[PDB]
Amino acid sequence: PTHSALYAASCIKRIAQTLKLSGPQELFKLFAPQLLYTWLDNDSIQDIAYEIFGFSSLLDLLREAQTEAAAIMMMRGQEQEVCQLAQSLGLTPEKLVQQSFTKIIAYSIAHDGESRMRKILGKEEYLANIHLNFADIISTFFDIFDQEDPIEKAFFAYAAETLEEIKKLGPMFRAKYLPREIVHLCSRTQYEPENIWTPALVVFVARKLLKTIHPALGPLHACSVLRKIRVLICLAGDHAISGYPLEMLLHSLRVFVVDPECADDALGITQYLIKRGDEYLKRTPSFLAGYALSSLADLRVFLESSQSSTTQESQFKATKSKAQEFHAWFSKYLAAYDSPEFKDEGQKQAFRSITENAAHIRASGNAEKGTHESNLLLEILKDWGRENQLLNEPARDVALSMLCGVFNIPPSSRLDVIETDEDAIKNGAVVWKSCSSQRLGGEYLAWAGRVLGRSFAASGEVPEDLLRESQLQEYRRLSQGVGSSEEGLLNLIKSLTISGDCFTAGLAEAALRTIVSDAISDNDHDLLSACQESLPEPLLIASNWDPYRTPLSDQFKVEVFSARALENPNWSQHLAIRLALSAPKIVTLRVLPPILSKVKGFAERAFPFVVHLVLAYQLDKQQSAKRELSESLQEWLNFTSEPAKENLKLLINTILYLRTQPLPGESSIADRAHWLDVNMASAAAAATRCGMYKVALLFAELAAESTRSDILLEIFENIDDPDAYYGLSQDASLSTVLARLEYENDGAKSLAFRGAQYDSHLRGRDLQSRQDCNALIKALSSLGLAGLSNSLLQSQQSIDGSSDSLDATFTTARKLEIWNLPAPVNSDSWAVTVYKAYQSMYQAQELDTVRSMVHDGLKNTVRHLSSGSLNTSVLRQQLGALAALTELDDILNVRDQSELQCTLATFEKRSKWMMSGRYADV
Secondary structure, three states, rough: OOOHHHHHHHHHHHHHHOOOOOOOHHHHHHHHHHHHHHHHHHOOOOOOOOOOOOOOHHHHHOOHHHHHHHHHHHHOHHHHHHHHHHHHOOOOOHHHHHHOOHHHHHHHHOOOHHHHHHHHHOOOOOOHHHHHHHHHHHHHHHHHHHHOOOHHOOOOOOOOHHHHHHHHOOOEEHHHHHHHHHHHHHHHOOOOOOOOOOOOHHHHHHHHHHHHHHOOOOOHHHHHHHHHHHHHHHHHHHOOOOOOHHHHHHHHHHHOOOOOOOHHHHHHHHHHHHHHHHHHHHHHHHHHHHHHHHHHHHHHHHHHOOOOOOOHHHHHHHHHHHHHHHHHHHHHHHOOOOOOOOOOOHHHHHHHHHHHHOOOOOOOHHHHHOOHHHHHHHHHHHHHHOOOOOOOOOHHHHHHHHHHOOOOOOOOOOOOOOOOOOHHHHHHHHHHHOOOOOOOOHHHHHHHHHHHHHHHHHOOOHHHHHOOOOHHHHHHHHHHOOHHHHHHHHHHHHHHHOOOHHHHHHHHHHHHHHHHHHHHHOHHHHHHHHHHHHOOHHHHOOOOOOOOOOOOOOOOOOOOOOOOOOOOHHHHHHHHHHHHOOOOOOHHHHHHHHOOOOOHHHHHHHHHHHHHHHHOOOOOOOHHHHHHHHHHHHHHHOOOOOOHHHHHHHHHHHHHOOOOOOOOOOOOOHHHHHHOOOHHHHHHHHHHHHOOOHHHHHHHHHHHHOOOOHHHHHHHHHHHOOHHHEEEEEEOOHHHHHHHHOOOOOOOHHHHHHHHHHHHHHHOOOOOOOHHHHHHHHHHHHHOOOOHHHHHHHOOOOOOOOHHHHHHHHHHHHHHHOOOOOOOOOOOOOHHHHHHHHHHHHHHOOOHHHHHHHHHHHHHHHHHHOOOOHHHHHHHHHHHHHHHHHHHHHOOOOOOHOOOOHHHHHHHHHHHHOOOOOOOOO
């Protein structure tokens, strides 16, 4: 490219539409270099097709193509055309050249015209711009250099041998330039062209290179970017093999090692780095444990997978052999590893076991006794629950997703890796923490169900992860050491460097670099004390622009105070950005919008810290955020909705968190009610809607203090205390005594009052009798009179009794042994699950069908426990269903008399626990 304009427009729209891209302009943002170069060679920008890459203007296409176009013009030379661009924009040529100075110098040095830049800015301003844009210029030098023959030019008398070793192990401008280019730029600043490779600059350039690759841009890009990274590693020398740069590079090069296109490059760089950084990896065994686990797992999976169609079937055997030998060498190195930095000998044995078992695992995981996958799973779980743990969350998540993705649950439980009631009580908490993901197969959920059921049948206690209702424990685990919001945000950002994709880790490293540098320069002691306790020392050193200045490529910037805004799933993100933008003087909030908008799920984790930081900042100034938030809360708290429940939980947790932060200039904790202005009755009602009853009770007490009973009833009925309900006063009648007797789960005593009501309503042809019948059924199923409740069931013909009738229709059937009911499928009821297991036990001729039905029951019960909003009675019912299915599975798998007697003895020990436990569970 008349119709060709429109056809090309539609084609580009379809290309960027069916490639996970935003729109056609975001497809011009990736290719503007090449299009503009090849086109502006012999043409002028003013007559370009703004109809492809839908823009609706040329002054819209230019507000994005200033930099590339200007730099290319000044690369070849169109001074009058740069002036025409500038005129059209609105900015004179001089401030324009001041906007895109970096790319201009990158290309010009590459294409040799810098004197022509001196003749427009000056001879004391141009050098200031080179001082301001040094690292961005080096980054743009590594972008455009073409990999042709770098080792030839190297002999810079150390890059040659280093690149030779890393090759022995395993606009475009030629490589021959690269050294001299740097020199010519660095002979006009103070920093000498020889040695400019502090770790901040190294990580900067390396992250630039990685971010350059893209999923839509092809798997042939990656191997070129990798060659250039090898050049950077050989050139930087001793700063890219120690400290945080070492960790950072090992991560991404691992990701390039599992790429079947070329694992020849990345395996070599990885060998060189691991071999050369031995003196450092012996100081950080916690990093090496997780890296070894992740890398070994990925390698094993890549070894087993074998699908080569667009790869030369011999090229594949080559790379497979290379991978196998790297695995054998790495396993030897790990077996020989021994560090003085191990906390105890327990940690050393854990390291040995983890590495050794991971070296010999298969493609999937199992739970048998004595295999490698089961020993590795047990080691990961046992480590998870500890205080000084080796693996971090990303490494453990990788290993678990590799083992538990396709699982193999043993048929019996004598061959199981967890077979005693004691191991189950010990590992129940961690096994529940494990099955709170979504990448877990069905057989792993069945195994986790068996373990949780054995733990509850042996202890009768709920894992505490299921009982907590607020997030205050997370907020206190983050903001630890000093207990401030700055440490909380620093931990949240630091956790993104290790648990992110190239983009996210880049955003986090950039934010930390700006934060730590501004804390070092301005000598902020509070923020310094926050950093020294949130970041380990290698990351605290690689975040400091000591001999440089923070580059303009890092600091990149990017109604919600009203109702009905609480319902869109991005309320937290928009509100957090809106708040963080209102406090630019706090450096920790200035760098946030670039992370709050990109990273997913970060705004919900960081919302309380942001709100507290803003409110504490503008305490003595004009209090704007306080006024806005406290005016919006009057509408947000009175919000009954299903889509708005998950943001209401976050508002309540923010209020709770602010209650624990000391006001400056306070006499008592009774002044922490001035962070915001909450109406505590509305907050109590809201917390009752969300199912947080202890939080609701706390708010109700604060409200009553503010004063000196319709919400207290809903609180008391559901809170988990035997005696609390009786403290509530209400007007007396036979109906209220009946309500108390049905709460109390009394036997004949509620049967009397209910029979009276039921008769009086049948006689008067009242419509409440149905409800009465419902209640009666409940009562008669809490006594044990199953025949009477059965007869009360058949009579009722409108079976529309929320879920009380659903459960009552199958408890009775199981007790009377009526095995022909058609059981609903996908039901949240424990009675239905247990009934289906026993029914299948009745109508089956082989044990395999019964085992399959039991395992399906365990799997579904665990998924329902993971579903979330369950109060305590339903929770304990589901756990009791797990226990019942586990005992069923235990007696189905007996083979001789000795196991029968062992099962009986197990029943006796569990009786020991049962004698004093809660009565419903028992």
